[PDB]
Ligand binder design. Sequence first.
Ligand SMILES: *C/C=C1/C(=C/c2[nH]c(/C=C3[NH+]=C(/C=C4\NC(=O)C(C=C)=C4C)C(C)=C\3CCC(=O)O)c(CCC(=O)O)c2C)NC(=O)[C@H]1C
Ligand SMILES: *C/C=C1/C(=C/c2[nH]c(/C=C3[NH+]=C(/C=C4\NC(=O)C(C=C)=C4C)C(C)=C\3CCC(=O)O)c(CCC(=O)O)c2C)NC(=O)[C@H]1C
Lengths: 457, 462
Amino acid sequence: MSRDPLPFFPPLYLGGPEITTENCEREPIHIPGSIQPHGALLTADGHSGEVLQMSLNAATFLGQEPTVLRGQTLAALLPEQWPALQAALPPGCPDALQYRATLDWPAGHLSLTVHRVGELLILEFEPTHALRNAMFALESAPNLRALAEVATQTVRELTGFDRVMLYKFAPDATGEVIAEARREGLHAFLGHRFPASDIPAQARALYTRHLLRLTADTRAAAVPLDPVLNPQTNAPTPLGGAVLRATSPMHMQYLRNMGVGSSLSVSVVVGGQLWGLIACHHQTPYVLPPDLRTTLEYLGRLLSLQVQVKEAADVAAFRQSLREHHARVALAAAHSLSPHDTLSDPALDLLGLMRAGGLILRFEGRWQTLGEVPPAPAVDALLAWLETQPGALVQTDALGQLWPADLAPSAAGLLAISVGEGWSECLVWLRPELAEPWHPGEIEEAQDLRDTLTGAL
Amino acid sequence: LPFFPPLYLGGPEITTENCEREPIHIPGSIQPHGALLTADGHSGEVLQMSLNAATFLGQEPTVLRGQTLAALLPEQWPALQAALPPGCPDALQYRATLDWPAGHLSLTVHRVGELLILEFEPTESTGPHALRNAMFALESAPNLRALAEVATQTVRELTGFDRVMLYKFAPDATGEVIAEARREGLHAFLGHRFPASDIPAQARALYTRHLLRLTADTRAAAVPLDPVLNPQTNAPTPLGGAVLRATSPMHMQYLRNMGVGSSLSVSVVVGGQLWGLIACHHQTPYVLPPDLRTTLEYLGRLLSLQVQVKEAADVAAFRQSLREHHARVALAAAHSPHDTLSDPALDLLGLMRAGGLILRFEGRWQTLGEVPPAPAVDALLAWLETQPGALVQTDALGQLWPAGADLAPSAAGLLAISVGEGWSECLVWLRPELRSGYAEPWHPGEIEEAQDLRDTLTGALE
Ligand SMILES: *C/C=C1/C(=C/c2[nH]c(/C=C3[NH+]=C(/C=C4\NC(=O)C(C=C)=C4C)C(C)=C\3CCC(=O)O)c(CCC(=O)O)c2C)NC(=O)[C@H]1C
Ligand SMILES: *C/C=C1/C(=C/c2[nH]c(/C=C3[NH+]=C(/C=C4\NC(=O)C(C=C)=C4C)C(C)=C\3CCC(=O)O)c(CCC(=O)O)c2C)NC(=O)[C@H]1C
């Protein structure tokens, strides 16, 4: 889930491998060299504004002759916008930043979206309060599930989409539909789980930076960029920040198998990490208007923050229940005439403090244990390994990977603190293999215990 | 003690002595840049109208009253009932655009009790999308101060307002301008502190529920509702959820003293509590368009969450630098509280950057540092006993506790925690007045540190 994606294969127009379920992660979805036909795309030099590339539908769509359009400057094409465009998108700005305008064209009202990648401007053209009311229901939501339900119902009312889901990522990057608003007659996805590869790592990475993407018509063929390569670089044009970017054929096929005619998702990003997706399906082709997409992008940002805040409160609520327990222990440690007698007291329940299966206590050149632990030789080896570790805290949810593993029945997870320096005196909490991850609160609680014990002893 | 009656019910004239009792939610009047109707929730019979309704709606108030929303708004009336069902929150709004002989007309409707309130104002996505672009700068902001600066700069670019401030409330409801974006030439309010009464309790309460309010023209007279009382109840019409609500005259005077021609603020609400305000000033009258107001309401919601997150990070960063000291204190508390907590080695004074400290335990008290004399301490402790909860904190003890204003040399700022219930045992950190009546504000990290101390001591002593 946090892993960097494997490096991309070349695209099909550069003779790249055919994409299968075995090589999902390596499809270069960001450089399809093509767009969706409900809009037109130009690329232009960031300095001169010379038009370098155009989609093959762009001449017809803008009503200019191909030869005339290619080579023209944005000064000539977009005299009113060109000045504002340069100011809004200065060199080195993020590629997610966008200049947007509304044009009159000989095709009525036309939406223009511009963004910058490297030395290249990418211009996308396409034809062109209920949220405010849902904000109360969003704020009121007493938990993540309730919030998910409100979000999906809200988005469905906004868009008219036949299905709207909140898809939540597990730490292994598998997903679960935790909420769903759907048209009567459709079978429910609610509660269904899906493998990591249904949204592969390069997609999840892309979706952490570019927060909305869509397929307007799942039966429509992509329109190529001409030339397909960027003349500046003689390399593929990055289209990750372009909403008109052509969708992965693999995914479009998957959509068609689901009888989905149109699709849209918005990223839910929490702590720089992709938490989930607002996933929308329509049975029929549907170009969602640009202004409504803006609304969904806003909803995504709001929901992201609501999750971050709610999760922070769960953490704080959990850590509060470790202070009461910690106080009991600090009290005992203050009076202690021997850490062995005090800390091994079942009444103190140092096991339960960390939701551990086992605990090793070493003090005064001897150790003892509570709960399920490895046998004495394994404990001795564990302690000998610990001595080699720098710092005063070691924590792992898979001891095997860090310390190559046979202790996994009782000691798959490990959390150890030095009570002083050198690990001559220490506590080691152990957890069995499924280990259940140490909560960040349990880690800080261990740090607090280190201080307390270091002082008291 | 209750709100005073409004002026049209012969209520007291509002002064600096009786601020908190002005019923700002029932002024029985609106701002003249729009029109307001009220109507029965069931029948849609028009019950009240602003005396200017005629300019906006084309018809005379007397003529319009008695007609139904079915007759007046045939297209919207069906949708209006569905959007605002009985018992819905009063913050919920139906909105529409109407065609009128003169561009268009913006209609905003909301429901209070058995009453629908309809607001009409003239109207004509640059703003919504300009917000989208600012979201990156908001997310990027590395701390609360930087976030505050981005927020104010963003709002100023959206609106064109001459000044945009982020006003943060202390827990005693005193405030500080923690960020400011202003036109060239204006003197800065940044860092200035203001007493609780500049935004009084009933205003702050209203602002926790209704998140945007404005004064379009600070020299323009409010337009009365006719009749002023609600025929349903023979009582004042709640206008708290109406953006056209007339502004408190006291506040409008304050705005004029500041050379403010137009004012708008958005509530920053964090944990159901008013955290602060995005406060906007224009030197000249300015009706912000309805669509831009919608944008600001959205920004306020977003910023509320961004503030909570960014502020939590500042607190954690601050408390990390106090961990060694905190541990020392927790260790000592785990072991007579008088002997332990008075120990200079613990330095409970320095923990909170305090000048003084009162320790009450076992029916006696003692002090460290600069403190008031015994009778003042006894009075302070007696006042504390009357306070609800287990934490009292103030950066200006005088404003909250007027009899304690004379303690300002040693006790301008106060932070007190109960170690039992009822304040029989407590700690009181004191700070001197700044070299008026304000002490250096308590950092939110020092507050949570105090809460942690409370828990530890409460547990250890029981
Ligand atoms: C070889 C890899 C495969 C693959 C590729 C793939 N998938 C996406 C994007 C999406 N896949 C989604 C999956 C689901 N949609 C649903 O409705 C459900 C279940 C109810 C699932 C699991 C979703 C939501 C997306 C996001 C895009 C969207 O909103 O429509 C991509 C990237 C698409 C692009 O941006 O170009 C790729 C390459 N899909 C597979 O199933 C595996 C075999
Ligand atoms: C004795 C009465 C007083 C009084 C009452 C009062 N104040 C408000 C509302 C506001 N006061 C604000 C204060 C400030 N604006 C600034 O620019 C600064 C500092 C530079 C401060 C301290 C603000 C921002 C508001 C909100 C309204 C707005 O956004 O303009 C009310 C309620 C107004 C209403 O909603 O009807 C009342 C009754 N304020 C005083 O200062 C004293 C004179």
